[PDB]
């Protein structure tokens, strides 16, 4: 029983990339769950194989992350291309991972093939016939089902919460009292849309010191439509093991919605954040039944609670480390459940 695990458009190398590191620690759950599992990406590495060195068909399940298949200016993506041209090779079913609502598969042919590059691959190298299954973080299938309208190989769908692939890790480790430089932080991207939206509704024009590391800058947020006078401090990236370290050094780190993903996604950003030392806060509007914690403590529902709540936890340290310990106490519940999260995944590759 060989396992193949692959990021469908990105290099996998290490934890500097979001995309990377999701691929990384999938690899590393999937291991230390008793399974035979390779990582196969563009280069020999520590944690990869190279597709040029492997045959596809010694691999018993392809499992593949999502990811876009744009191509950035117009040139080739082997990254994209390579991954494919493996996909396309596979004759068995494929497990299609979807993290982000917005990287349905999709096919790269039809775009390659109107290239002025498209002398580099044939239809048959990179069109995937075969039949997939997608794997939705999502509670809600017809969510997936939608964004996945374009594609017809797509025949299977099964929620799966992939997000907590961090909290089932050997090594894991809840962050210990750290010292406060910040009220509120918040580690992650710009994206267009009602997460801009909420971004300057809860880390904006709030008064209280507010820092956002990751890649997004204040230039990002000139939508009209989303107004602010003031921004929150904005640093730059680190690698994805450190994040729940990094959300630590603030009394309270955000949980914001999306499109979509509200009352369906529990993203990743919820376990990094409950497993650090900053109090979780959460957007009302992203878990409107409380499914994360039944404790309406932990939820803002504007930027004018935000600002109550967080000068509450600043004016009262026993109220903070007591909410700290819920929620800590509310994550291990969920990790106590990994013997049935890890045959859940099982069932869910057909094993
Ligand atoms: O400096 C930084 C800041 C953030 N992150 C990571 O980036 C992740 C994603 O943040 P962001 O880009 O804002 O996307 P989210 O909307 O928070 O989450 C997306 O990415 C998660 C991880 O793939 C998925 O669980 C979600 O469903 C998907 O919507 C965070 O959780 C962190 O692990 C870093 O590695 N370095
Ligand atoms: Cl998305
Ligand atoms: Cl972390």
Redesign the pocket.
Same mark, same amino acid.
């Given at each position: 029983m060989k396992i193949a695990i692959i990021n469908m458009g990105n290099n996998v190398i290490n934890?500097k #990339?979001?995309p990377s590191?999701?691929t990384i620690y999938l690899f590393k759950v999937i291991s230390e769950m008793g399974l035979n599992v390779d990582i196969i990406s563009l280069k020999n590495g520590v944690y990869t194989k190279s597709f040029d060195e492997v045959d596809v068909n010694d691999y018993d399940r392809l499992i593949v992350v999502n990811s876009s298949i744009n191509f950035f200016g117009g040139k080739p993506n082997l990254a994209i291309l390579s991954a494919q041209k493996f996909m396309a090779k596979y004759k068995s079913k494929i497990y299609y991972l979807f #993290?982000?609502?917005r990287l349905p598969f999709s096919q790269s042919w039809p775009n390659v093939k109107n290239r002025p590059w498209a002398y580099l691959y044939t239809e048959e190298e990179l069109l995937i016939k075969s039949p997939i299954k997608v794997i939705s973080?999502g509670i809600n299938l017809d969510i997936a089902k939608a964004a996945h309208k374009k594609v017809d190989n797509v025949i299977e769908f099964e929620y799966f919460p992939?997000?907590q692939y961090k909290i089932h890790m050997n090594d894991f480790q809840l962050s210990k009292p750290t010292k406060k430089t910040l009220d509120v932080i918040y =580690? =992650?991207?710009f /994206?267009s849309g009602q /997460?801009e939206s909420k971004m300057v509704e809860f880390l904006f024009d709030t008064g209280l010191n507010i820092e956002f590391?990751?890649?997004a800058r204040e230039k990002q947020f000139k939508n009209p439509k989303y107004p602010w006078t003031k921004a929150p401090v904005f640093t =730059?990236?680190?690698?994805?093991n450190m994040?729940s370290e990094?959300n630590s050094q603030a009394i309270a780190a955000l949980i914001?919605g999306?499109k979509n993903?509200n009352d369906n996604?529990i #993203?990743? /950003?919820v376990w990094?954040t409950m497993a650090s030392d900053a109090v979780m806060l959460i957007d009302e509007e992203f878990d409107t039944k409380h499914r994360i914690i039944n404790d309406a403590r932990f939820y803002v529902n504007n930027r004018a609670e935000l600002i109550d709540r967080v000068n509450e936890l600043k004016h009262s340290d026993v109220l903070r480390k007591e909410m700290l310990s819920i929620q800590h106490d509310i994550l291990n519940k969920t990790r106590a459940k990994k013997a049935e999260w890890q045959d859940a995944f099982k069932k869910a590759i057909d094993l």
């Open positions: 934890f #990339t979001v590191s999701e #993290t982000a609502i973080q992939i997000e =580690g =992650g991207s /994206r /997460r590391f990751g890649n =730059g990236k680190i690698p994805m994040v990094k914001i999306d993903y996604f #993203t990743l /950003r990094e």
